[PDB]
Nucleic acid binder design. Structure first.
Lengths: 211, 223
RNA sequence: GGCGAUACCAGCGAAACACGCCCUUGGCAGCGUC
């Protein structure tokens, strides 16, 4: 089958930047290549077809080109409605094949995270398990280190990050430490340590078991 | 206008079978090619199968050939995807797509559906336990406070978490679900509120887990 | 140039295959016949 190698896999660009996404076919596909735009949680939408023909209703900022087995999708200048993932797809032979996709995110100034620590819930300690949650509200960039507060724990923590907010272009992160409630009541002060670029020094939020 | 409505998704064991449907409105599928494309959670689009008009010829991807069957019923204006010998690899949202008319859009897929969620796993359905994330800042600090809810150990996806019955959307953050080592999902939903609203504003997280018919509302106020 | 076939790749018929159309062309094809 025809493989579709797409590059880059992700980028961060600012409004007004000219970007060209490259999709290269493993063999001749003529010009039967389309491009799709997919925004988180939504269905894909057709942008251009036949390598270089724009679909109805799509702005003129989108363009496509072919150079043999090479296919580039070009947005002349980024705009505050184009944050999404972009895919190339060949329709020259079956099986049709999509590219791996390109995640387009928005560049913006550095934002420091607001950190909150949440002790395990009195309803939850009744169940015999403990869970401390550290929150890193609205920051930029996604790159953040969360370490659990006093031997530093390893292997018993999970992280989750939201998508880029469509308004302030920020990110949020959560980290959950488990162990057990029996272990939870043998230690005293609990603290999550976070390092971020917009932070001059690591910030540690903590609580005392006993309010 | 033109609509594609996929149905039939759900939870099955490995080796099980599922039959997906795609109801079309605003056009007749007998004059177009219908494609199925799936997307695993957090990954890219993957072409699955397609059927051609007039001839009814079918085509498949190497990962589904022999196990899947695409077909159509023009009297019902509905395409179908029979799924057999399912593996965990087939866990994805399955989209239905119409190939546009050759003159106007070439061979591009000009219309898609909302998709249906197919989960292939041996894990049994389980409802989540819900615990509060008590607010940090007090009621008269003069700044911002962060509160939320922790719903934990549920399978399969998805859940939906709202606040104040959809009335509170500014500043809310429902984090994507992570897979614990126990095999069950868990996520958190938070929100930043002004400290001047604590004690006068009521905050309730409404968590909905349809796969297990579980409905919980948990109250969040200063501990 | 004149007369008759031949539908390979494109294009076209709501149409990637099948079906149908278009005959020096849509390509600065090629076989018969004056």
């Amino acid at each position: 089958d025809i493989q579709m190698t797409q590059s880059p896999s992700s980028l961060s660009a600012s409004v007004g930047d000219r970007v060209t996404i490259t999709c290269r076919a493993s063999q001749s596909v003529s010009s039967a290549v389309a491009w799709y735009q997919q925004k988180p949680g939504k269905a894909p939408k057709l942008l251009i077809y036949s390598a270089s023909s724009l679909y109805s209703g799509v702005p003129s900022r989108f363009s496509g080109s072919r150079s043999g087995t090479d296919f580039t999708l070009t947005i002349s200048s980024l705009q505050p409605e184009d944050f999404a993932t972009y895919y190339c797809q060949q329709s020259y032979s079956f099986p049709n094949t999509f590219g791996q996709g390109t995640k387009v995110e928005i560049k913006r100034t550095v934002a420091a995270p607001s950190v909150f620590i949440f002790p395990p819930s009195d309803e939850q300690l009744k169940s015999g398990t403990a869970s401390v949650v550290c929150l890193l509200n609205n920051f930029y960039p996604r790159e953040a280190k969360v370490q659990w507060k006093n031997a530093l724990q390893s292997g018993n923590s999970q992280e989750s990050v939201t998508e880029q907010d469509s308004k302030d272009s920020t990110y949020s992160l959560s980290s959950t430490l488990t162990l057990s409630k029996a272990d939870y009541e043998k230690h005293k002060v609990y603290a999550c340590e976070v390092t971020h670029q917009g932070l001059s020094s690591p910030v540690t939020k903590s609580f005392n078991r006993g309010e | 206008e033109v609509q594609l409505v996929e149905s039939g998704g759900g939870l099955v064991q490995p080796g099980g079978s599922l039959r997906l449907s795609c109801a079309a409105s605003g056009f007749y599928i007998s004059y177009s090619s219908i494609h199925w494309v799936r997307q695993a959670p957090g990954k890219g689009l993957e072409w699955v199968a397609s059927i051609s008009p007039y001839s009814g010829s079918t085509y498949y991807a190497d990962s589904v050939k022999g196990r899947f069957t695409i077909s159509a019923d023009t009297s019902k204006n509905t395409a179908y995807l029979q799924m057999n010998s399912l593996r965990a690899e087939d866990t994805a949202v399955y989209y239905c797509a119409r190939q546009g008319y050759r003159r106007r859009s070439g061979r591009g897929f000009d219309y898609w559906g909302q998709g249906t969620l197919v989960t292939v796993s041996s894990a049994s359905t389980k409802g989540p336990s819900v615990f509060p994330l008590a607010p940090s800042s007090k009621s008269t600090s003069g700044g911002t406070a962060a509160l939320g809810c922790l719903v934990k150990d549920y399978f399969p996806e998805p859940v939906t978490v709202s606040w104040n019955s959809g009335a509170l959307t500014s500043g809310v953050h429902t984090f994507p679900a992570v897979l614990q080592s126990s095999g069950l999902y868990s996520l958190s939903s938070v929100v930043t509120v002004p400290s001047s609203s604590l004690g006068t504003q009521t905050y309730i997280c409404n968590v909905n887990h349809k796969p297990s018919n579980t409905k919980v509302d948990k109250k969040v106020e200063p501990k």
